Every structure is written in C-alpha cells, then in structure tokens.
Design a protein around this ligand. Structure first.
Ligand SMILES: CS(=O)(=O)c1ccc(O[C@@H]2CNCCOC2)cc1
Length: 339
C-alpha cells in the first residue's frame, strides 16, 4: 500500500540524514552513577547507570578499546554506533548518548527493566503460538524497516530481545549490524541462528535475517532451537543439511511458514522472493495479526514482566563487579576517530 511505501520512504530519508552526519560526544562518564553490571562479554559489558542530574536510568554499554582492536571488532563497533544514532523504530532500543575517553567507548541506551526474552522463555518452557506470533510480528516489522535502510541485523536471538513495560520487544545489540546494499562476507552471529550461506563462507545478504527469524519462531514455539546439538560443528552440520523436525503440537500453518523461512536455498527463502516481506505478512500463520495495530502498540501484550520500577534489576542476573578504569594516556585514538 502507498501508505507503507510512503512510511518507508520517509524512514529512509530520516535515517540517511543522521547517517551522513553522526552525532558524537554527547555525554561523559562522570555524569552518571554506576549501579549494576547486567551482562558481560569478550570486549565489554552493559551496566545499569543513573544520570546524576535528571535521575533517569540507562543501560550503558562500555567497550574496552584495546580489546575491540585485539578481537578485530573495530569496524563492527563503528557500525554499531553509527547505525544506532541514525535509526528510529518502535521496537529498537534507543541510543540516548555516546562518547569515548582514553580507554573506553560508551553507548548509553534506554534501560528496559523487563529483562531478556531468553530469561522468560527458559522460565516458562515455550510460548503458545499466539504469544510467539505477537513477538514474531514485531521482528517482521523491524526487519522490514532495517532492510529498507539497507541494514542487515545479523544477531537475532532471544538474548537480544528485551521485554518492555508494555510487554513489547525492544531489540538490543547492533554489534553485527551493517549497511550493505548487496553482499557481505564476515563470519558472525551465534551458532544456532546462522544461515547455511554464513556457515559456508559465501557472500550473503539480508536473507540471513529471515533465516534467523525462522530459528527464533521455532525456538519460541518449541522451547529449543531447530538445529540443536552439543558442539558448533554438529550444529553447523544440521543447519546445512536441509532437514528439520517439528513437534507435533506445532500447527500446520506454523510448520509451513518455518519450512519457507528455514529454506536452505536462499533464492527460495521467504523474505527474499519477488514479494519480499509480504510473503511473510500474508502467510496464513499471521492471518490474525493486525500489522498496523502492532506497529502502533495498540495490541494488548500476552505477558507483562514483573518489576518494581525503572531502576529494578531483578529480571537481570548477577556478575562480578569490575572497575571502569580510564587510563591517563589515550589508547587507540586513531582507530576510533569517527566514534
Ligand atoms: C560485546 S561485549 O563483550 O561488550 C558484551 C557486553 C554485554 C553482553 O551482555 C550479554 C547479555 N545477556 C546477559 C549475559 O551477558 C551477555 C554481551 C557482550
């Protein structure tokens, strides 16, 4: 419909203006109080912080420059910040500030207190099809938005989907997101969610996100992912094989959609055909979905996370609390000039 076409045209205009003139240096570390580590990885962490003047809470991602360099994530880190400061969509966590110092890079995001979908899914076991469908619809709209901007996301998994106070999804972690008009080649993403063409070291495209959506919908509705095995090499063998087993409790419509998203041949995969995303939106499994009402956040969510207020961390887990040290000397200044 022309209304969707004009929406996406405006979305791309607004993205490009910020893309071509990125914001930089919009806060500093001593404007915030550190509260609690919410997650950690090989080159950084995410911490709940509170702004000292406004009292607002944020999730601050802190990346160690020297580790980013050592683990060959420079371009990915520059992609992450440049994309986040340019996008705007109801189901994406919002970047509020960014800055750097002698040691670290900082991306200060809205704090979503309801926790990761991964926690809720593993607690309940599996989501009913209507519950899975509510979340899947949000990812479909989000990928329609990102792909129309020539952005591939490349990190879909339950850990990256935060549940907000209204029960809606907020996608976090743009560390693998990239502006790509055609193909791209980097090996990245978690093993269970990789498309076959990533595993086979091909030049791949945005069809890998639609494969990952198939994995996510399967895992939400089953409680475990479709290509599960003990070690990555065994997972990769199952992914490239072109066979899946569906639980008998899956509806026929759900199985049909999944066979079309988990299509090994990327030229036959839903989302990547002539009709693009509309083959997904018009599929029978989504017949009950009001796409506009989802976008407008007018649908009552299936699940509202339990939390006490905007500073509650009970839906996140516990990690060793480490210093945020800042060297007296500048590290890796050249590499991160544009940040
Ligand atoms: C890219 S990084 O190395 O900076 C990094 C920071 C934070 C991370 O958080 C996840 C969140 N889920 C809870 C467990 O922690 C892992 C992961 C990686």
């Amino acid at each position: 419909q022309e209304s969707v076409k004009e929406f996406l045209a405006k979305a791309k205009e607004e993205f490009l203006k910020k893309w071509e003139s990125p914001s930089q240096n919009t806060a500093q570390l001593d404007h915030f109080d550190r509260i609690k580590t919410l997650g950690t990885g090989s080159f950084g962490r995410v911490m709940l912080v509170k702004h000292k003047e406004t009292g607002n809470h944020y999730a601050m991602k802190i990346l160690d420059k020297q580790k980013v360099v050592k683990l060959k994530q420079i371009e990915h880190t520059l992609n992450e910040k440049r994309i986040l400061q340019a996008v705007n969509f109801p189901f994406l966590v919002k970047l509020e500030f960014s800055f750097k110092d002698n040691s670290n890079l900082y991306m200060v995001m809205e704090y979503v207190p309801g926790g990761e979908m991964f926690s809720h899914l593993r607690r309940i076991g599996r989501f009913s099809e209507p519950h899975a469908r509510f979340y899947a619809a949000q990812i479909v709209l989000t990928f329609e938005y990102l792909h129309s901007l020539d952005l591939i996301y490349r990190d879909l998994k339950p850990e990256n989907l935060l549940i907000d106070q209204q029960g809606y999804i907020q996608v976090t972690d743009f560390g693998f997101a990239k502006r790509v008009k055609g193909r791209t080649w980097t090996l990245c993403g978690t093993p269970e969610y990789l498309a076959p063409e990533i595993i086979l070291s091909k030049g791949y495209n945005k069809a890998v996100d639609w494969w990952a959506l198939g994995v996510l919908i399967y895992e939400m509705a089953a409680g475990y992912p479709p290509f599960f095995a003990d070690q990555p090499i065994q997972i990769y063998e199952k992914i490239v094989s072109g066979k899946v087993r569906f639980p008998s409790h899956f509806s026929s419509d759900l199985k049909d959609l999944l066979r079309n998203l988990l299509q090994v041949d990327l030229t036959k995969r839903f989302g990547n055909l002539k009709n693009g995303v509309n083959d997904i939106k018009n599929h029978k499994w989504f017949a009950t979905t009001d796409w506009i009402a989802i976008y407008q956040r007018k649908v009552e969510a299936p699940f509202i996370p339990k939390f006490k207020g905007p500073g509650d961390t009970s839906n996140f887990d516990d990690y060793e609390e480490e210093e945020i040290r800042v060297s007296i000397n500048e590290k890796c200044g050249k590499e991160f000039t544009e940040f």
